[PDB]
């Protein structure tokens, strides 16, 4: 948004997250052995999904992959889920020990209220497209205002992910998630989880390439699997 400072021929070029093929290429480039078995190409889609297309964390991955095996690579695939970005923070061409140290700052500059919204998007599902109202449950203040915050939030460090149609929906990636995991107040995780089961049942009392229908928001139980893990995290 700093470009709004300039009244001019402002032109823009966005560096997206490294697409899955470009990720293969980055691995190939420095001598990392490419898959065969299905749960190895899957292990690598696990890494690429986790490091939601991210140069720096990919490099930290290689640098921390010691023997080079897919096996010890999956070791890391665990470490990333049960230790967040701090599991793979390493000496890298990046000025930063870990992408989390960077995102820290990225999180500091934020409008106090946006700092709140972001702080809350933990208790969501990562790598999932979800409606504005479905977000209105955890986000502070017609709740379109949520969209204004979530837009500012992707605009200011590319922390979210907007997708206009089929329906105005947003989405949170994985690096940007495990940032928030081991970083937001351990309580506030469980508080956001509960505040969600609350408005969900609230909506309950009013009565793949497919978005979640308004007949079915009432059960976020679809993501119970990951939701159960988040719950296993906060309250211990």
């Amino acid at each position: 948004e700093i470009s709004n400072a300039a009244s001019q021929t402002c032109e823009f070029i966005e560096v997206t997250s490294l697409e899955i093929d470009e990720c293969y290429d980055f691995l190939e480039a420095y001598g990392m052995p490419m898959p065969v078995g299905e749960k190895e190409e899957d292990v690598l889609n696990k890494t690429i999904e986790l490091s939601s297309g991210n140069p720096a964390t990919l490099m930290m991955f290689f640098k921390s992959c010691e023997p080079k095996t897919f096996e010890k690579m999956a070791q890391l695939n665990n470490k990333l889920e049960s230790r967040g970005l701090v599991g793979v923070e390493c000496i890298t061409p990046y000025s930063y020990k870990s992408l989390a140290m960077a995102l820290q700052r990225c999180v500091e500059v934020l409008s106090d209220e946006d700092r709140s919204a972001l702080a809350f998007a933990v208790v969501m599902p990562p790598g999932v497209d979800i409606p504005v109202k479905l977000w209105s449950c955890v986000i502070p203040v017609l709740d379109d205002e949520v969209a204004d915050r979530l837009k500012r939030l992707s605009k200011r460090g590319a922390l979210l992910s907007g997708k206009r149609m089929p329906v105005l929906t947003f989405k949170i990636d994985h690096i940007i998630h495990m940032f928030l995991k081991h970083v937001v107040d351990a309580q506030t995780i469980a508080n956001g989880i509960s505040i969600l089961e609350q408005r969900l049942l609230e909506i309950g009392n009013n009565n793949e390439t497919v978005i979640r229908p308004e007949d079915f928001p009432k059960f976020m139980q679809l993501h119970q699997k990951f939701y159960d893990s988040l719950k296993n995290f906060a309250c211990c």
Binding site: Q104, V107, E108, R115, A119, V183, V184, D185, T188
Partner: peptide
């Protein structure tokens, strides 16, 4: 103490 430092 929401978040960390900050």
């Amino acid at each position: 103490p929401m978040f960390n430092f900050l």
